[PDB]
Amino acid sequence: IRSYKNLNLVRANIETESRQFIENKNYSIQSIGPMPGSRAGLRVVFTRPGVNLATVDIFYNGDGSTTIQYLTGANRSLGQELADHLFETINPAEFEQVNMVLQGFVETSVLPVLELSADESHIEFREHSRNAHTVVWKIISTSYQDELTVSLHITTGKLQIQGRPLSCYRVFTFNLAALLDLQGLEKVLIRQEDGKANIVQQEVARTYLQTVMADAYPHLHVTAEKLLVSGLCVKLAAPDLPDYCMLLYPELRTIEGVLKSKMSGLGMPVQQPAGFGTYFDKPAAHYILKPQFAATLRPEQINIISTAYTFFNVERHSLFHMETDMARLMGKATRAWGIIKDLYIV
Amino acid sequence: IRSYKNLNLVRANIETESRQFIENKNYSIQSIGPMPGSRAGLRVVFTRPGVNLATVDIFYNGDGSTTIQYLTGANRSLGQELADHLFETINPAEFEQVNMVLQGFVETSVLPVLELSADESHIEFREHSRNAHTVVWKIISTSYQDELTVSLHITTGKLQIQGRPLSCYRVFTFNLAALLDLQGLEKVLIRQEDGKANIVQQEVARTYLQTVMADAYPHLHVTAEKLLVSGLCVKLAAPDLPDYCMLLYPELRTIEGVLKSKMSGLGMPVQQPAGFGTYFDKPAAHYILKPQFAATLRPEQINIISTAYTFFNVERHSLFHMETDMARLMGKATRAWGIIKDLYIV
Ligand SMILES: [Cl-]
Ligand SMILES: [Cl-]
């Protein structure tokens, strides 16, 4: 079932979290300290009146891993409670491993997607290594201890992505989705090879798209429409996955296009330093256009733009920061289609 | 590549047809007669002023096929013209071969649809043989030289269909589609094994349907909705084919369902001997209800029923008698969905 070996815990967060756990069930600490003996780690010995002393050993591995042992001592039933508290401070996406190869890349096409991914405030990249066969970049997250290894095999033009599907992976694949064919898109979105989005009848998917987007269908640019039909066939052919929310990437991307090109048609060009922020404020959970810009539009146009940016901003924020059933994804997908529709209808 | 061996030509029609070719190209007959020797057939020697005599030998084989030999004589180029004329008197579907096995059938499940298919004017069936392990039926057509072999292995309950995707195949599989699961439905509709309809995400297809059926989606019968989503997932996963027209089966039967039970609720139950022939007439090229029945209903109800039955009737007539681009198939699919939701909304 559940295994506590080689966890990816934040080391600086262990002790604090353990202490507050103990104080939330009003248990009492017998001792918390460095682990005796060769191995580095933490020993937490706590109890509650009525049962024996629970001992939990927290070993520090050499690769930054952590292992929790609760089956020692005289109260394993109690120590497992602390073990589970520590285990549930980890994002599930931390128990996964990504190791993909995309075809047809060279350095002048890959560098831009890295620089766009480093235009977020919590993402940094740097050139890790290079010879004449491969060039390796690493993408680090400043808030979470998360690094993604992006290696470009020059002579084969093959791009390798290694690590865990966390915030660097998500930002990078989001900015990289603009360039990919159907199979590459399906690879980055479902994290599996041998996916079968390529067998979906593209003309039946296209009739799906005309049905849900009606009058906007002639105004879509084929950038937008071929990424929407490609998203449709990634969704229709998706396997069973614990989280489907990366499948929302194709729609968000086209929202980011259409909004960013509607607003510039109304005297609101989007720049690189400030971007969307210069044009919106945020009372409660809403984004609303600032009054100086809202006084130039009409009341129907102000809300199409505001709810569009709210949707785009908060679902990209929750995808990029790991929140910070295919039915939920389809609900958000059809909301998105309605949004892209309304933006073309106004 | 093109090969003129083992064609299935209507033998009694060969001679006249060749004669008419000769009279349409103003060619002149040197001889038309039975082929000399044991093997029966026809020898056609014709010419036009300016070239040599073309000889075309048309052998009748033991399996009812016919073979055309045009490389005899002194004019291969001219005789091939007649060979090609005869060759294009054959339906492309007659060069195809179907040999499939469907699972989970019993004798009381097959006899009804096999007998239902023999209530057509050009279809009759008979029990060909039976022992204690399997029982074989044949379905022969009265107009075309076409027989379909339907063998049910009792002990394993497997039903296998052998022959050509012609008139009998279409009638039988049409009556059989209401009973099938997704994989069997796709088997009979695309006449290929190893299809990939089962990988279509049933929830995205179901949202497609929920979108196209507007208010009718909550009152659709669960029978109807399951047949419509199975049709949607066979179309989305359809391989690449010369004719897509059997993909219309799931909707046609569903209309026949909804129609036959919405007229069941307003005092017009449909029987087996007559059917819908004692309700609507045959004016021009449409199907209007008879005045005795139209005078009891409302003005939209008379036309919902006549246009619905007209669509059903003429698309079934064109599919059963081989009247003849996924775009065209989708075009009729949208018209079918509009009809079914109009019958639920009226
Ligand atoms: Cl690829
Ligand atoms: Cl089957």
XYZ file of C-alpha atoms and ligand atoms in Angstrom:
694
model
C 0.000 0.000 0.000
C 1.653 3.176 1.312
C 5.461 3.204 1.674
C 7.531 5.807 3.553
C 10.941 5.010 2.057
C 12.816 7.618 0.034
C 10.326 10.424 0.527
C 10.941 13.836 -1.028
C 10.335 16.000 2.030
C 11.479 19.544 2.677
C 14.137 18.893 5.316
C 13.860 22.369 6.889
C 10.122 21.697 7.319
C 10.270 18.345 9.145
C 10.825 19.433 12.746
C 8.437 22.396 12.667
C 5.738 20.266 11.074
C 6.210 17.458 13.582
C 6.018 19.908 16.458
C 2.815 21.474 15.236
C 1.335 18.049 14.568
C 2.047 17.123 18.187
C 0.424 20.325 19.387
C -2.682 19.814 17.244
C -3.555 16.507 18.932
C -2.231 17.762 22.306
C 0.310 14.978 22.454
C 3.387 15.613 24.596
C 6.998 15.581 23.385
C 9.424 13.364 25.205
C 12.322 14.443 22.977
C 13.107 15.724 19.497
C 16.713 15.651 18.387
C 19.532 14.586 16.085
C 19.653 10.870 15.459
C 22.243 8.961 17.531
C 24.822 7.011 15.619
C 26.364 7.248 12.208
C 23.254 8.081 10.202
C 22.121 11.699 10.060
C 18.483 12.419 10.724
C 15.896 13.228 13.348
C 14.392 11.249 16.214
C 10.897 12.197 17.410
C 9.727 10.466 20.609
C 6.249 11.590 21.663
C 3.284 10.195 23.570
C -0.253 10.715 24.830
C -1.480 9.696 28.312
C -2.684 6.116 28.147
C -0.309 4.516 25.632
C 3.409 3.906 25.288
C 6.124 6.119 23.832
C 6.009 6.356 20.054
C 9.411 6.583 18.357
C 9.740 7.802 14.755
C 13.147 7.722 13.054
C 13.713 10.127 10.161
C 16.846 9.130 8.220
C 18.559 11.531 5.812
C 19.733 9.854 2.624
C 22.619 11.050 0.486
C 20.499 12.095 -2.510
C 18.351 14.497 -0.448
C 15.773 11.722 -0.027
C 14.253 11.075 3.404
C 13.126 7.778 4.940
C 10.630 7.557 7.813
C 10.584 4.453 10.011
C 7.681 4.043 12.434
C 7.857 0.269 13.053
C 10.479 0.586 15.802
C 9.863 1.205 19.467
C 6.898 0.410 21.687
C 4.026 2.200 19.863
C 3.939 1.725 16.087
C 0.215 2.556 15.903
C 0.891 6.044 17.259
C 4.073 6.742 15.283
C 2.358 5.960 11.991
C 0.190 9.021 12.700
C 3.247 11.294 12.530
C 4.571 9.364 9.541
C 1.305 9.974 7.673
C 1.228 13.648 8.624
C 4.695 14.025 7.089
C 3.744 11.909 4.065
C 0.689 14.089 3.340
C 2.781 17.251 3.184
C 4.063 15.925 -0.176
C 2.334 16.616 -3.483
C 1.374 13.326 -5.218
C 2.987 14.618 -8.450
C 6.238 14.212 -6.416
C 5.896 10.374 -6.543
C 6.031 10.454 -10.395
C 9.047 10.534 -12.798
C 9.170 12.115 -16.320
C 11.741 10.918 -18.889
C 10.644 11.863 -22.409
C 12.170 12.458 -25.823
C 10.594 14.823 -28.353
C 11.793 14.876 -31.935
C 12.870 17.717 -34.193
C 14.448 20.426 -32.083
C 17.542 22.560 -32.457
C 19.016 25.066 -30.072
C 17.568 28.189 -31.689
C 14.032 26.819 -31.268
C 14.499 25.575 -27.689
C 16.292 28.566 -26.121
C 13.206 30.836 -26.628
C 10.914 28.470 -24.720
C 13.401 28.424 -21.843
C 13.523 32.216 -21.794
C 9.736 32.451 -21.795
C 9.648 29.971 -18.946
C 12.165 32.045 -17.044
C 9.932 35.098 -17.444
C 7.830 33.739 -14.582
C 8.958 35.066 -11.209
C 9.737 31.669 -9.609
C 11.526 30.004 -12.551
C 15.200 30.251 -13.497
C 17.225 28.395 -16.083
C 20.947 28.080 -16.691
C 23.207 26.244 -19.140
C 24.407 23.183 -17.245
C 26.824 21.497 -19.645
C 27.769 21.308 -23.310
C 29.871 19.321 -25.728
C 29.319 18.779 -29.459
C 26.690 16.036 -29.078
C 24.470 17.371 -26.320
C 23.756 20.632 -24.542
C 22.086 20.457 -21.129
C 20.101 23.214 -19.397
C 18.556 23.031 -15.938
C 15.325 24.762 -14.925
C 15.047 25.453 -11.205
C 12.100 26.694 -9.196
C 12.884 29.306 -6.559
C 9.958 28.563 -4.240
C 9.922 24.767 -4.434
C 13.079 22.665 -4.521
C 12.374 21.458 -8.052
C 14.781 21.080 -10.983
C 14.108 19.893 -14.547
C 16.873 18.659 -16.845
C 16.369 19.642 -20.497
C 19.012 18.018 -22.699
C 19.198 18.768 -26.439
C 20.922 16.101 -28.551
C 22.321 18.324 -31.313
C 23.192 15.746 -33.958
C 19.859 13.909 -33.617
C 17.785 17.002 -32.878
C 16.171 15.080 -30.022
C 15.012 16.884 -26.894
C 15.032 15.061 -23.591
C 13.017 16.139 -20.561
C 13.847 14.555 -17.201
C 12.651 15.038 -13.655
C 9.282 15.279 -11.956
C 6.087 16.826 -13.341
C 6.186 19.818 -11.023
C 6.162 23.551 -11.628
C 9.188 23.764 -13.932
C 7.852 20.896 -16.046
C 4.431 22.546 -16.229
C 5.688 26.030 -17.173
C 8.125 24.605 -19.722
C 5.604 22.277 -21.367
C 3.058 25.115 -21.438
C 5.416 27.414 -23.362
C 6.588 24.454 -25.483
C 3.069 23.381 -26.477
C 2.970 26.183 -29.055
C 5.516 24.388 -31.278
C 4.496 20.739 -31.048
C 2.692 18.400 -33.390
C -0.186 16.225 -32.195
C 2.004 13.413 -30.892
C 4.365 15.715 -29.006
C 1.455 17.626 -27.488
C -0.063 14.335 -26.336
C 3.305 13.272 -24.903
C 3.775 16.385 -22.792
C 0.140 16.485 -21.660
C -0.397 12.828 -20.678
C 3.216 11.920 -19.813
C 3.024 8.630 -21.739
C 4.417 7.211 -24.941
C 2.295 5.193 -27.363
C -0.671 7.476 -26.853
C -3.248 7.256 -29.596
C -4.495 10.788 -30.234
C -3.235 10.301 -33.806
C -5.993 7.716 -34.507
C -8.832 10.135 -33.647
C -10.786 11.105 -36.768
C -9.755 14.731 -37.041
C -12.846 15.688 -39.079
C -15.262 14.354 -36.441
C -13.342 16.331 -33.839
C -13.596 19.350 -36.116
C -17.367 18.947 -36.325
C -17.384 18.800 -32.528
C -15.523 22.087 -32.510
C -17.895 23.785 -34.972
C -20.832 22.605 -32.908
C -19.611 24.106 -29.647
C -18.139 27.311 -31.123
C -20.759 28.224 -33.775
C -20.205 31.760 -35.063
C -16.619 32.051 -33.844
C -15.468 29.127 -36.005
C -14.779 31.377 -39.050
C -12.838 33.919 -36.949
C -10.401 31.459 -35.366
C -6.881 31.715 -36.721
C -5.605 28.281 -37.714
C -2.922 28.591 -35.066
C -5.862 28.671 -32.657
C -8.040 26.156 -34.460
C -5.386 23.516 -34.986
C -4.337 23.759 -31.362
C -8.015 23.431 -30.349
C -8.681 20.387 -32.541
C -5.407 18.917 -31.276
C -6.534 19.501 -27.690
C -9.838 17.869 -28.557
C -8.136 14.710 -29.783
C -5.754 14.659 -26.827
C -8.846 14.726 -24.609
C -10.839 12.146 -26.581
C -7.933 9.687 -26.609
C -6.620 10.324 -23.104
C -5.916 7.195 -21.049
C -6.888 6.915 -17.385
C -4.802 9.294 -15.291
C -4.905 10.595 -11.716
C -5.034 14.206 -12.940
C -6.377 15.485 -16.254
C -5.795 19.174 -15.721
C -2.791 19.495 -18.016
C -5.264 18.610 -20.785
C -6.586 22.141 -20.289
C -3.354 23.510 -21.814
C -4.582 23.838 -25.450
C -7.558 25.994 -24.468
C -5.695 28.235 -22.026
C -3.025 28.872 -24.656
C -5.576 30.033 -27.212
C -7.304 32.185 -24.592
C -3.921 33.777 -23.922
C -3.681 34.461 -27.638
C -7.167 35.756 -28.338
C -7.467 37.974 -25.257
C -3.943 39.313 -25.805
C -4.931 40.217 -29.372
C -8.392 41.575 -28.571
C -7.024 43.890 -25.876
C -4.341 45.283 -28.172
C -7.154 46.019 -30.619
C -8.652 48.317 -27.935
C -5.565 50.333 -27.025
C -4.159 47.890 -24.440
C -1.009 46.280 -25.884
C 0.542 43.594 -23.695
C 4.257 44.084 -22.993
C 6.984 41.797 -21.648
C 7.879 43.541 -18.320
C 4.401 44.357 -16.955
C 2.093 42.254 -19.159
C -1.526 41.846 -18.071
C -0.946 43.289 -14.592
C -0.921 46.918 -15.743
C -4.552 46.604 -16.871
C -6.273 44.751 -14.015
C -6.960 45.024 -10.302
C -8.201 42.417 -7.871
C -10.977 43.031 -5.369
C -11.906 39.703 -3.705
C -11.329 36.767 -6.118
C -12.193 38.849 -9.203
C -9.940 40.571 -11.639
C -11.615 43.737 -12.937
C -10.265 46.244 -15.446
C -8.940 49.364 -13.778
C -11.338 52.325 -14.103
C -9.013 54.408 -16.329
C -9.129 51.631 -18.933
C -12.716 50.572 -18.207
C -13.972 54.069 -19.037
C -12.876 53.570 -22.655
C -15.033 50.434 -23.197
C -18.755 49.574 -22.889
C -20.332 47.445 -20.125
C -20.583 44.291 -22.247
C -16.926 44.546 -23.264
C -15.646 45.125 -19.719
C -16.957 41.826 -18.414
C -15.984 39.625 -21.385
C -12.422 40.848 -20.829
C -12.449 40.667 -17.016
C -13.875 37.142 -16.612
C -11.584 35.986 -19.449
C -8.483 37.223 -17.643
C -9.775 35.866 -14.326
C -10.237 32.391 -15.795
C -6.905 32.432 -17.626
C -4.944 33.816 -14.686
C -6.289 31.609 -11.928
C -6.212 28.324 -13.817
C -2.697 28.981 -15.084
C -1.748 29.973 -11.529
C -3.171 26.756 -10.132
C -1.498 24.651 -12.839
C 1.872 26.397 -12.452
C 1.935 26.350 -8.633
C 0.305 22.891 -8.191
C -3.015 24.280 -6.898
C -1.780 27.461 -5.164
C -12.459 13.061 -12.696
C -12.533 13.908 -16.414
C -15.852 15.582 -15.587
C -14.136 18.523 -13.834
C -11.765 18.980 -16.758
C -14.612 18.899 -19.268
C -16.565 21.441 -17.231
C -13.574 23.774 -17.227
C -12.972 23.026 -20.918
C -16.470 23.995 -22.009
C -16.326 27.095 -19.801
C -13.109 27.917 -21.672
C -14.729 27.335 -25.066
C -17.563 29.660 -24.117
C -14.954 32.262 -23.110
C -13.000 32.013 -26.370
C -16.395 32.188 -28.167
C -17.506 35.331 -26.366
C -14.146 36.938 -27.060
C -14.628 36.407 -30.784
C -18.312 37.463 -30.583
C -17.424 40.884 -29.149
C -2.401 -3.798 -61.863
C -6.143 -4.391 -62.299
C -7.153 -8.051 -62.520
C -10.097 -9.486 -64.448
C -9.991 -12.916 -62.823
C -12.756 -14.296 -60.600
C -15.131 -11.403 -61.066
C -18.681 -11.785 -59.818
C -20.619 -10.678 -62.882
C -24.263 -11.465 -63.560
C -23.670 -14.177 -66.151
C -27.094 -13.996 -67.793
C -26.388 -10.277 -68.302
C -22.890 -10.426 -69.821
C -23.807 -10.898 -73.481
C -26.495 -8.218 -73.820
C -24.314 -5.806 -71.856
C -21.340 -6.349 -74.167
C -23.683 -5.959 -77.142
C -24.833 -2.619 -75.819
C -21.224 -1.530 -75.365
C -20.607 -2.413 -79.007
C -23.628 -0.375 -80.055
C -22.571 2.642 -77.979
C -19.041 2.782 -79.405
C -20.319 2.090 -82.948
C -18.186 -1.043 -83.025
C -19.068 -3.974 -85.289
C -19.542 -7.584 -84.220
C -17.560 -10.273 -85.984
C -18.922 -12.991 -83.696
C -20.651 -13.440 -80.331
C -21.184 -16.972 -79.144
C -20.616 -19.802 -76.712
C -16.995 -20.587 -76.086
C -15.958 -23.847 -77.770
C -14.864 -26.730 -75.596
C -15.844 -28.155 -72.239
C -15.664 -24.991 -70.139
C -18.753 -22.850 -70.720
C -18.564 -19.159 -71.458
C -18.678 -16.552 -74.195
C -16.360 -15.440 -77.002
C -16.751 -11.891 -78.329
C -14.850 -10.839 -81.461
C -15.560 -7.234 -82.468
C -13.812 -4.490 -84.413
C -14.031 -0.968 -85.796
C -12.821 0.072 -89.258
C -9.127 0.887 -89.001
C -7.860 -1.660 -86.465
C -7.704 -5.430 -86.094
C -10.253 -7.828 -84.616
C -10.459 -7.812 -80.828
C -11.118 -11.177 -79.162
C -12.410 -11.274 -75.587
C -12.869 -14.682 -73.953
C -15.203 -14.770 -70.944
C -14.901 -18.045 -69.017
C -17.501 -19.205 -66.482
C -15.793 -20.857 -63.497
C -17.171 -23.491 -61.123
C -17.571 -21.146 -58.156
C -19.953 -18.876 -60.097
C -17.220 -16.303 -60.768
C -16.349 -15.182 -64.286
C -12.885 -14.544 -65.774
C -12.129 -12.133 -68.631
C -9.199 -12.808 -70.961
C -8.431 -9.958 -73.339
C -4.801 -10.748 -74.246
C -5.814 -13.187 -76.995
C -6.192 -12.300 -80.604
C -4.828 -9.401 -82.583
C -6.083 -6.400 -80.586
C -5.392 -6.318 -76.855
C -6.053 -2.557 -76.612
C -9.535 -2.845 -78.084
C -10.716 -5.889 -76.145
C -9.597 -4.352 -72.866
C -12.166 -1.591 -73.488
C -14.916 -4.213 -73.255
C -13.203 -5.893 -70.315
C -13.181 -2.597 -68.404
C -16.820 -1.883 -69.229
C -17.781 -5.259 -67.790
C -15.470 -4.680 -64.819
C -17.192 -1.408 -63.935
C -20.535 -3.112 -63.915
C -19.464 -4.515 -60.486
C -19.953 -2.740 -57.144
C -16.567 -2.083 -55.484
C -18.043 -3.643 -52.349
C -18.251 -6.988 -54.171
C -14.447 -7.160 -54.155
C -14.395 -6.965 -50.363
C -14.570 -9.884 -47.954
C -15.953 -10.021 -44.414
C -15.114 -12.834 -41.964
C -15.797 -11.778 -38.367
C -16.828 -13.340 -35.053
C -19.034 -11.606 -32.477
C -19.237 -12.892 -28.911
C -22.172 -13.708 -26.675
C -25.075 -14.829 -28.841
C -27.725 -17.488 -28.340
C -30.202 -19.063 -30.718
C -33.144 -17.058 -29.379
C -31.063 -13.901 -29.912
C -30.141 -14.590 -33.550
C -33.341 -16.114 -34.926
C -35.382 -12.909 -34.320
C -33.016 -10.545 -36.214
C -32.333 -13.141 -38.947
C -36.126 -13.584 -39.464
C -36.659 -9.781 -39.123
C -34.193 -9.314 -42.006
C -36.153 -11.829 -44.092
C -39.259 -9.641 -43.890
C -37.641 -7.564 -46.637
C -38.802 -8.116 -50.206
C -35.355 -9.111 -51.505
C -34.086 -11.085 -48.478
C -34.968 -14.635 -47.428
C -33.072 -16.906 -45.053
C -32.991 -20.619 -44.325
C -31.424 -22.918 -41.746
C -28.574 -24.431 -43.760
C -27.356 -27.083 -41.333
C -27.289 -27.908 -37.653
C -25.672 -30.430 -35.378
C -25.090 -30.403 -31.664
C -22.128 -28.044 -31.639
C -22.932 -25.269 -34.158
C -25.867 -24.205 -36.359
C -25.457 -22.443 -39.715
C -27.984 -20.205 -41.501
C -27.734 -18.727 -44.973
C -29.255 -15.405 -46.052
C -29.746 -15.185 -49.828
C -30.869 -12.153 -51.839
C -33.539 -12.376 -54.527
C -32.340 -9.475 -56.700
C -28.537 -9.755 -56.479
C -26.567 -13.009 -56.463
C -25.541 -12.654 -52.820
C -25.457 -15.085 -49.884
C -24.328 -14.429 -46.290
C -23.299 -17.254 -43.953
C -24.272 -16.810 -40.286
C -22.878 -19.595 -38.070
C -23.613 -19.762 -34.324
C -21.362 -22.026 -32.231
C -23.710 -23.006 -29.391
C -21.161 -24.285 -26.877
C -18.996 -21.145 -27.116
C -21.888 -18.872 -28.067
C -19.917 -17.239 -30.873
C -21.625 -15.910 -33.985
C -19.519 -15.650 -37.133
C -20.492 -13.852 -40.324
C -18.894 -14.758 -43.653
C -19.320 -13.250 -47.105
C -19.357 -9.851 -48.792
C -20.523 -6.458 -47.454
C -23.489 -6.335 -49.790
C -27.293 -6.274 -49.443
C -27.696 -9.118 -46.984
C -24.849 -7.934 -44.771
C -26.387 -4.472 -44.568
C -29.895 -5.643 -43.656
C -28.664 -8.185 -41.103
C -26.175 -5.910 -39.347
C -28.777 -3.136 -39.327
C -31.245 -5.318 -37.448
C -28.354 -6.554 -35.249
C -26.857 -3.191 -34.203
C -29.361 -2.526 -31.397
C -28.058 -5.578 -29.509
C -24.327 -5.057 -29.735
C -21.748 -3.707 -27.336
C -19.232 -1.070 -28.452
C -16.653 -3.485 -29.835
C -19.182 -5.590 -31.747
C -20.889 -2.461 -33.062
C -17.578 -1.166 -34.387
C -16.829 -4.605 -35.856
C -19.994 -4.704 -37.921
C -19.794 -1.019 -38.901
C -16.160 -0.828 -40.097
C -15.765 -4.527 -41.060
C -12.283 -4.601 -39.527
C -11.007 -6.317 -36.420
C -8.593 -4.647 -33.985
C -10.563 -1.393 -34.083
C -9.850 1.349 -31.549
C -13.261 2.659 -30.444
C -12.740 1.373 -26.888
C -9.968 3.921 -26.258
C -12.262 6.893 -26.922
C -12.868 8.669 -23.625
C -16.564 8.031 -23.100
C -16.930 11.259 -21.078
C -15.677 13.651 -23.763
C -17.904 11.952 -26.314
C -20.780 12.193 -23.876
C -20.210 15.958 -23.548
C -20.250 16.181 -27.357
C -23.687 14.569 -27.266
C -24.863 16.672 -24.309
C -23.924 19.770 -26.322
C -25.637 18.761 -29.570
C -28.859 17.570 -27.868
C -29.501 20.737 -25.784
C -32.741 20.226 -23.833
C -33.378 16.718 -25.142
C -30.359 15.238 -23.337
C -32.141 14.823 -19.941
C -35.166 13.048 -21.492
C -33.264 10.740 -23.868
C -33.817 7.101 -22.941
C -30.716 5.416 -21.577
C -30.992 2.948 -24.459
C -30.954 5.864 -26.901
C -28.069 7.656 -25.187
C -25.933 4.547 -25.055
C -26.499 3.844 -28.731
C -25.680 7.431 -29.600
C -22.444 7.525 -27.595
C -21.413 4.168 -29.087
C -21.986 5.631 -32.547
C -20.005 8.720 -31.609
C -17.062 6.616 -30.454
C -17.058 4.427 -33.542
C -16.987 7.562 -35.707
C -14.237 9.254 -33.692
C -12.047 6.126 -33.970
C -12.961 5.190 -37.518
C -10.048 3.998 -39.619
C -9.537 5.201 -43.113
C -12.132 3.693 -45.453
C -13.576 3.814 -49.002
C -17.165 4.196 -47.698
C -18.276 5.541 -44.303
C -22.015 5.242 -44.754
C -22.738 2.394 -42.364
C -21.506 4.688 -39.588
C -24.998 6.190 -39.809
C -26.556 3.023 -38.314
C -26.575 4.075 -34.611
C -28.661 7.176 -35.306
C -31.100 5.579 -37.757
C -32.079 2.831 -35.323
C -32.352 5.449 -32.584
C -34.776 7.470 -34.701
C -36.662 4.244 -35.358
C -36.716 3.760 -31.607
C -37.824 7.249 -30.681
C -40.275 7.538 -33.561
C -41.756 4.094 -32.941
C -42.352 4.895 -29.286
C -43.430 8.512 -29.557
C -46.142 7.459 -31.998
C -46.759 4.625 -29.528
C -47.744 7.233 -26.922
C -50.302 8.936 -29.175
C -52.384 5.921 -30.199
C -50.483 4.771 -33.304
C -48.595 1.575 -32.397
C -46.492 0.209 -35.249
C -47.002 -3.437 -36.241
C -44.789 -5.912 -38.109
C -46.811 -6.842 -41.269
C -47.539 -3.290 -42.503
C -45.352 -1.089 -40.231
C -45.201 2.656 -41.083
C -46.874 1.983 -44.476
C -50.364 2.305 -42.898
C -49.543 5.740 -41.353
C -47.682 7.891 -43.951
C -48.079 8.030 -47.783
C -45.533 8.496 -50.643
C -46.131 12.044 -52.066
C -43.499 13.311 -54.585
C -40.206 12.339 -52.840
C -41.253 13.050 -49.198
C -43.350 11.124 -46.595
C -46.475 12.952 -45.258
C -48.887 11.444 -42.650
C -52.372 10.336 -43.751
C -55.193 12.835 -43.072
C -57.101 10.430 -40.805
C -54.092 10.439 -38.453
C -52.994 14.052 -39.057
C -56.395 15.411 -37.971
C -55.948 14.159 -34.372
C -52.507 15.668 -33.695
C -51.004 19.177 -33.511
C -49.452 21.056 -36.454
C -45.832 20.609 -35.407
C -46.423 16.958 -34.495
C -47.600 16.026 -37.996
C -44.447 17.434 -39.566
C -41.983 16.220 -36.925
C -43.310 12.748 -37.659
C -43.411 12.926 -41.440
C -39.940 14.531 -41.832
C -38.488 12.108 -39.251
C -39.927 9.037 -40.949
C -38.946 10.397 -44.369
C -35.307 10.743 -43.305
C -35.299 7.303 -41.678
C -37.054 5.604 -44.598
C -35.036 6.961 -47.490
C -31.694 6.604 -45.728
C -32.545 2.988 -44.937
C -33.632 2.392 -48.536
C -30.384 3.873 -49.832
C -28.248 1.860 -47.387
C -30.029 -1.456 -48.049
C -29.943 -1.333 -51.866
C -26.430 0.153 -52.273
C -27.453 3.509 -53.728
C -23.890 4.828 -54.120
C -15.876 11.794 -47.414
C -16.372 11.785 -43.608
C -17.632 15.386 -44.136
C -20.762 14.045 -45.946
C -21.323 11.339 -43.254
C -20.999 14.030 -40.511
C -23.413 16.283 -42.479
C -26.190 13.633 -42.285
C -25.221 12.856 -38.640
C -25.989 16.496 -37.621
C -29.363 16.274 -39.479
C -30.121 12.988 -37.617
C -29.319 14.549 -34.210
C -31.503 17.538 -34.978
C -34.350 15.184 -35.867
C -34.093 13.103 -32.691
C -34.049 16.127 -30.417
C -36.962 17.681 -32.302
C -38.897 14.499 -31.559
C -37.982 14.766 -27.899
C -38.876 18.483 -27.816
C -42.226 17.964 -29.590
Cl 7.518 13.066 -30.905
Cl -17.038 -8.791 -30.042
